[PDB]
């Protein structure tokens, strides 16, 4: 017959191998598929979905409905931020649990832009200004409203538009970051003006926060760390 020469790698089973294989049911007429709504062709389609950030992971707030709400109140006008969110989507406990983070935990490398979307859930009457800042990687996060204003920022008007979609850029020395450890930036929200309200309307509102990958986002080198 055809003289062959069995090479190294013969009779080994590599779990990453991709060969043909004999069908155990070769005469069996498979149930044909139907057009179900919602076919996912890629996992990033699930990371491109605005999911809600848990900001308060304290002992009480966590694992409830309150861990997501950031409460704006009326107290002494301290320059410190309402929230400061580090942009370690995998190595930040807050973004780690989002859908994005759940998909990033399955991978080693990632690259792309994130879009954060804060959402005022207060009154139609209430008015005011927040300042949504973005410190780039390497920078030590802004501690006062002035430091934040001078850098990149968006003066969000609570009175006019009820959301604010700031998009982070892709800044990294490598073509890809890691999902574990080291910076990546900081979103941070300050009061520009203490929130005004009309009559006996409550002076304690809430802002929600969403995150999602952008169309430029990509991951690689699958790494499942799931076990018991």
């Amino acid at each position: 017959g055809l003289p062959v020469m069995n090479t190294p790698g013969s009779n080994q089973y590599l779990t990453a191998d991709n060969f043909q294989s004999p069908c155990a049911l070769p005469e069996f007429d498979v149930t044909p598929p139907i057009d179900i709504p919602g076919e996912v062709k890629n996992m990033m389609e699930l990371a491109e979905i605005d999911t809600m950030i848990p900001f308060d992971l304290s002992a009480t707030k966590k694992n409830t409905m309150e861990m997501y709400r950031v409460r704006l109140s009326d107290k002494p006008h301290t320059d410190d931020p309402i929230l400061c969110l580090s942009l370690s989507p995998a190595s930040d406990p807050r973004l780690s649990h989002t859908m994005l983070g759940e998909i990033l935990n399955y991978y080693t490398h990632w690259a792309g832009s994130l879009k954060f979307t804060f959402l005022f859930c207060g009154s139609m009457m209430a008015t005011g200004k927040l300042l949504v800042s973005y410190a780039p990687p390497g920078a030590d996060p802004p501690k006062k409203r002035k430091e934040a204003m001078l850098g990149t920022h968006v003066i969000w008007d609570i009175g006019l538009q009820s959301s604010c979609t700031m998009v982070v850029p892709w800044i990294s020395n490598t073509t890809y970051r890691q999902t574990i450890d080291t910076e990546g930036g900081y979103i941070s929200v300050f009061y520009q003006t203490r929130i005004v309200v009309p009559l006996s309307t409550p002076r304690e509102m809430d802002i929600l926060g969403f995150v999602s990958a952008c169309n430029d986002f990509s991951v690689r080198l699958l790494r499942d760390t799931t076990h018991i």
Binding site: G38, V40, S218, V219, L221, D224
Partner: protein, 191 residues
């Protein structure tokens, strides 16, 4: 930019062990009903595949099963045994499962069977999509789980003097995957 490794095929089609089926040699000393091993194909045991599939509601996939058999003598005794053969029988859905070592199911024409000779390349088959429904339902909000089949395993040699235990690792690789209707992924908590 490239989103190939985050495609459903790349994310899912990865050889993952799903069970370790242990069978003893038909030794005539005191052997129990451990002479054969049976395991209903189910992803609800391995957390990796399950947690990846429960990202999504429905599904369809061929199922490439590889079988890595590894035996060893049990007793320190001067053990000797000719090369064992293993019958690895796939039982389709809705079919009867073996109860005894010498049940009739091991002679049924329906049930496809592999005859793996020990010390050779790992055995393999490719189960197709065996669903009555047009998609495997991972979550079903109704009243009366999905049947993929059963894998039964035995040693074919019968009157053996020395006991020989053997473990059959089953490396399931879903192939040609499609998934619909994503969902939030479960925590690792209840697994």
């Amino acid at each position: 930019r490239s989103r190939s490794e985050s495609s459903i095929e790349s994310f899912f089609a990865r050889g993952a062990c799903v069970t370790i089926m242990t069978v003893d040699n038909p030794a005539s000393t005191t052997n129990k009903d451990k002479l054969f091993a049976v395991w209903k194909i189910t992803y609800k045991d391995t957390v990796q595949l399950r947690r990846k599939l429960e990202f999504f509601t429905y599904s369809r996939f061929d199922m490439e099963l590889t079988f890595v058999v590894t035996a060893n003598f049990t007793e320190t005794n001067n053990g000797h045994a000719l090369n064992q053969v293993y019958q690895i029988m796939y039982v389709p859905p809705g079919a009867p499962v073996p109860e005894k070592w010498d049940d009739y199911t091991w002679q049924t024409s329906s049930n496809p069977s592999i005859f793996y000779t020990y010390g050779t390349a790992p055995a393999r088959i490719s189960v197709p999509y065996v669903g009555i429904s047009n998609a495997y339902s991972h979550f079903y909000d109704g009243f009366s789980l999905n049947d993929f089949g059963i894998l039964a395993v035995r040693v074919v040699n019968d009157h053996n003097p020395t006991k020989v235990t053997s473990k059959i690792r089953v490396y399931l690789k879903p192939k040609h995957i499609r998934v619909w209707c994503p969902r939030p992924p479960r925590a690792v908590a209840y697994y």
